Symmetry: C5
Subunit: 394 residues, 5 copies
């Protein structure tokens, strides 16, 4: 009854097109804040951030006032979209197909005219994602809010500190903070400020998933490629091991494909590490082929060069600490024995080529193990957030 | 005719903005329940629960009353959205792009004014999914409902036990229960309660799919890696078997990729088991290479150390229960025979290295079989719901 | 002119909220049918059926009547959504995000008041899909239609036989039939029936795609694993063949992954067949390793046991129908010859171990071929619809 | 001013429910055409065609007429949806979730009452796709348009030739043509025609993508399988080559999976060709195993049968154009020499088995090369559109 | 108060159907521009461009004028969709399911009647994408804007230079420019121009992603195939290396599949390069098989032809710079020695076939290395934008 009288009275001559100020020259203050509930997606390719956010707007409507003694029990009235005036505050850098992601709830007003509008939404904002340091990257995503048509002398947009009391932690990203900043804009025509409120969402990528599902499968496969150097050449499986390890890494590259970004703004750190892994495993297969040329060298081919003999068999091998009728019977038997002697001389030349190949294996083992470690620790710890990341995620 | 008169009479001076109470100071009770028909999706990455739910709301409209003797045959009237007042009860933790998932059906009212509103919907709710114990994980998803703008002195939200009589069992999740709880909230300004009704949907992941399409393909591939230790070194296929088993497991890791979650909140149990499998198969290839170094050891290399001879050939091998012209003719023939004697001495040294490699194979077989079983049974039975899970799903 | 007069006359005092009966106590009959044009999707995971369906509703509006002599040429009038009354018949088990999939076309009415409403739609219905017998499964999907708010004394819902004259045959599913059944419901409060009309869409999965893209690639790969038993042990490729066949089957398991359902309600028939295939191929690699232990057995190891010699070399091999100076010269020459004699004795022991391995190969060939055939024909023909399926699809 | 007067005058007593004819018994002619801009998708699984189309409708409104001398400068008026009458022409075989894909633009009317309505849309139509001859298939997709509620005595639907002047050529499909045909329908009740206008979009699949990304990768892999027959048996890599080629083809089958349709209406031509490829490569591995049994046949096994010796070594090999103290010393030396003689006899028997295997290799080479070519050229040129397709696409 | 009076005054007799000109014969000028914020997607298959764009429209409304001295403080009024007249400027080549992607914001008007409409949107436009030169391709996408129903004497559409001040650089595409051009159209009926404004978005594909994730993995795998020629034939792993490299390339072809376009309008440059890679690796396996036939040639087969001996062993090998009782004892011993002599003659014939195979390896190495380099540099540098692309992206 009092409620029914009040609602009928409040809408009389009310124009939702009117900015509700007692003085049309003076400004209308709007307090803008938001409440971040979730970070939903950080899409690299589309360059979009998806968040669950409750916007908070407060302002005063000069016309929606009543004395509560004259309307006992009626302390607040609600109005649905299109019935009272509302600030046209929109997310400027919206990437949503609708552009306005808000669900238009009721606007709460008390007897003094204080309006409270709490539109929820699943916002999509345009954000430049820098994947240079991926997986250890850190993003700074701006959420720029302002009025679509009212300058600062009409809609004076003020800012209130963002709320994160109901924030759900994500499993992919840390929330560092969501500071806001009210900034004015100026047109050369005029002196009027044009305010906006930008909340910069700062978020750190969690790296436990990437450590356990990429580095460990990648380091382990990268270590098996070095295992070729410990495998004898007589196993007949040195190429089998190395080329199948490369094949495994080709198969693993498909998993890496899905998660990897797809940009040309930089080479991601993760792409450097996996790219390097490929080269080291590819070169291991190369030196394996060179080793087998030594191991299977023809005994009746080119004599071991002096420099080959000097470098491998002496210096490197020291550094590595390796190291009537009866007369014709005499003729035939001697032929058999001297043939065994030639066979043994060729076997000894072959043994020297085989030891040269063992020495090249030990050198390739050391060289590749060192290169592997220095490329792993160097690429990974290059990231400015590496130590922090491992400290918080492991 | 009576119906037409009643509908015209009921809308006269009716304001859908008005909370329909005879006394504007007294509260309006709303009975809130839901009916769960389906659990549609439990998305780990988005942290969203998708459910088919029929909401149930009941309340009394003071204005929608008539005497049925004066309107014979007209016992109930229906009203579409926006014509009568409705409670603004919304899912607070909604993750839907629309935020309101309900389909606004008609509100049923009888002659006494009892309103019944049964909005169906496909709701999307924000839920923290804990995949620590995946596949044996259990989720507890809150569905928090309340009025967007009416405190407890205005909209007194009461709760009724949720219905599951029309629940369709899922193929991925058990339904443990859906208990509800009415909880009040307080603001330091005021003494008024702010009620909400939270239905906590508790659901257990069924594990038959994961047993049959992951463990069995994973255990079987994990067992073939142990088969390398029974394969002779003379087959020339020991690396072929082990490295192709690893390759198969790299290929299987791609299938595992799709289903696995993608978080850094914890290491899922399934990730521990598959990660361990990789290490055990990788190490099997490592010890295989060590075995081949023994099998293919040069007869003219370093003599079998004392400790090598003691450890392998004696202790471990016992534990395993393994164990003129004519004178020149004499010269040449003796050379041939003494050459055969040296060849046999080198063959015997080689046989002792080969038996050392057979002993290392039997030891690696036992060690890896034990490690495999203890990591399988230990990781799997670590899950607090393991015994239950297997009891209900197998 | 007559049309314009009629439309103005019909809407005078017309309330689209009013159920259009001359007597408000008597019921309003609604004839409900549908026309199935397409089966669009049978989604296992979501438990949803997608269909193209034209609903058919007929009823009488007491108010939309005119004499055609007074309105010459005007025999029918059409009305768009929200202008005249409409039955609130909805699909109860809808799984659509909108819940109402219908496109609200015009309602056709003739001079006698007979209304005809033909809403088309792409309906999504909740359906339990039973994939126990997949690919030979048969689904029975209910489409339950009724009025959201009118009991049987108000809206008397009658059923008419469903039309399939414009049905487009699917490439994935046969249409067995779409019988309907009008069923009443009762509440313990009251005696009034609450009717619904359920059309049960019965559909058989076509199996030609699954025969040609799974069984044949699976049987062929399953046959190559048995080919290992015909491969000699001297090829040096027995493990290569078997383990690469398993690798191929691991690669094929990824294709199988996409199409396979993902439930824990049962083990699908297809999952049993492929799971069995894995075991048989895995065990083939196991017995291959055992065969190579016989083939490569050390001549100076443990003597062939009696039972090994009895079982393999006699019984199984029969069942398979297999089967001064001069004196020192004498000393040296005799050493050479007796060494050749020992070498030949060891070669003969080795030949007996090698024949034992050939016998185990022939036995493993027979055993695995029989197991393979019995598991293929047994799993496949277990399906209650197997013979029919092959008869209609091949 | 004249425009403002005209718009106010035209809407006076205008009913958008009224079919706008001067005589309510006479029909209203509607000229229907469309303009095809793009073919967007031909989805096999969903059985849907997606097209960008501008519909064209023309008709006369008896009421929207004015004299332009009385309204100088005002020659045309536009009206938005729901303000004037519009034909309810819809795509009958629509597969869109909205069913009406049109964007409701303004209707253009001149002073004589000629209305022009040009609704654009992205239409989804139900089309049976026949993939029997895929990749050389040709589709004929009907777009059936008619009025939802007006028979031919009310809405006389006439047809105008479709426009393709603004058609964007597709990269996947040729446009053969889009002929239309006006067809009447009759109900046994009545004599009134029920017209529809069906535009049959005829489109040929372009095959360059499928030639270059499937046939060439498939023929090349199919040729490498035949390369096994030229590889010597002493390489020790014959199974390695063949089984890895099959593995590669298993890996290639995954790419084939994505693009292949998924129906059981027929076996696609592409499925026959790839299915045949599998069999030929599988059988190549089979005959390779048979070849190795000949190559590695035991010298002390079963003597080469007469028919084996006759068939292979003579006929096929011709067709292929292949082809005191001293006495004991005598005893020991003779033993050594006669042992070498037996070894050479066994080597010669082995050489004859090895040549038999070379002959089986040359025969298997010829047989498989011929089978391969005849299955490639036969399957491919079976397609009725093969020669045309290659002529237009290559 | 002044604002409320003004809004009430402006809507009095205002018709949003009226083009707002003082003279109905004279035209209404509309200044059209846009502001490009983002390039979101360049979809090859759908032939669609997705962009984030703020449209800019300016025009004069004759009716929305007031004197600001009479309305102090009220300098601008805003109006929502459907309240004032708006130009019906649409994107003609729209590929959006809604066709109108704009979010209808308020129209800003000042006291002089100057209207400003700034609709944002995520536009989808139909664009022919030419992937002939992919990854070095350059696209020219037209965005054709015009009025749906107003010719040039009614709506005179003028163009203003497009803004890119708020353009976010993409990670996949450079923005070369967005020039616009106002073009008139003529109908043979009439002399009136029909203007449109086309902004041609020109954009260059960035190629760093494609260099690092395709060329390098492709060149490296293409180089390992050439490594077969350096591998000795005695390793027993030449086919293993080559066929596994091909297998790896088959696995890599799956990654290539996802990113590759799917058209038959041309063969993309990337498809030529990868297709060529396959042939070169396939042929390497072919020549490897030929090499092994030489290496494993039977010593007792066909004598090395003259031309074979001349070509390989002389010319090519020079170009490559390679190069009583006692009498019976005599009989037996001579048999042993002459047998060793025959064995050595066969070993020497075999050595000559083996050196012929080494020569064919060195020739195949040179031939394939040259072919590889010329096909890589030739295909890649064929692209007209190659040098630029590498200069800007590397
Ligand atoms: C696990 C580590 C594998 C090596 C074990 C040690 C071994 O095999 O020793 C052997 C090799 O001795 C070496 O030279 C070992 C070199 C260590 C490996 C270097 C790391 C990279 C290889 C991958 C690392 C694993 C990556 C994956 C790990 C998950 C012992 O032999 P030795 O003493 O050299 O004797 C030489 C001959 N002599 C007796 C005549 C002198
Ligand atoms: C992906 C990891 C596996 C998760 C499922 C565990 C299942 C364990 C099954 C143990 C064996 C049960 C046999 C009962 C008798 C039929």
């Amino acid at each position: 009854e009092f409620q029914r009288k009040l609602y009928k009275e409040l809408v009389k001559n009310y124009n939702p097109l009117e900015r509700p100020v007692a003085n049309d020259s003076q400004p209308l203050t709007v307090y803008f804040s938001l409440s971040l509930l979730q970070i939903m997606d950080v899409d690299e390719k589309n360059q979009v951030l998806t968040t669950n956010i409750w916007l908070q707007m407060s302002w005063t409507d000069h016309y929606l006032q009543w004395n509560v003694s004259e309307y006992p029990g009626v302390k607040t009235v609600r109005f649905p979209d299109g019935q009272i005036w509302k600030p046209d505050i929109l997310l400027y850098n919206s990437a949503d197909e609708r552009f306005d992601a808000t669900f238009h709830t009721n606007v709460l007003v008390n007897s003094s005219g204080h309006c409270q509008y709490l539109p929820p939404g699943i916002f999509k904002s345009s954000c430049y994602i820098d994947v240079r340091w991926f997986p250890f990257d850190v993003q700074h995503c701006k959420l720029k809010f302002g009025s679509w048509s009212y300058g600062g002398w009409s809609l004076d947009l003020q800012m209130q500190e963002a709320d994160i009391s109901g924030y759900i932690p994500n499993g992919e990203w840390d929330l560092v903070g969501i500071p806001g900043k009210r900034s004015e804009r100026f047109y050369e025509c005029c002196k009027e400020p044009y305010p906006d409120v930008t909340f910069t969402v700062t978020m750190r990528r969690r790296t436990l998933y990437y450590g356990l599902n990429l580095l460990i499968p990648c380091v382990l496969i990268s270590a098996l490629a070095l295992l070729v150097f410990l495998l004898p050449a007589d196993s007949g499986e040195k190429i089998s091991l190395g080329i199948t390890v490369l094949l495994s890494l080709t198969v693993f590259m498909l998993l890496v494909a899905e998660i990897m970004p797809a940009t040309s703004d930089s080479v991601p750190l993760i792409a450097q590490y996996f790219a390097s892994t490929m080269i080291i495993v590819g070169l291991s297969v190369v030196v394996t082929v060179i080793v087998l040329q030594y191991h299977h060298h023809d005994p009746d081919g080119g004599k071991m060069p002096k420099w080959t003999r000097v470098i491998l068999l002496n210096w490197c091998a020291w550094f590595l600490r390796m190291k009537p009728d009866l007369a014709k019977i005499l003729e035939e038997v001697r032929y058999i024995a001297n043939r065994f002697r030639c066979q043994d001389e060729s076997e000894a030349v072959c043994s020297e080529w085989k030891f040269a190949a063992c020495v090249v294996d030990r050198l390739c083992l050391m060289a590749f193990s060192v290169f592997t470690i220095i490329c792993t620790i160097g690429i990974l710890m290059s990231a400015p957030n590496f130590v922090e990341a491992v400290s918080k995620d492991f």
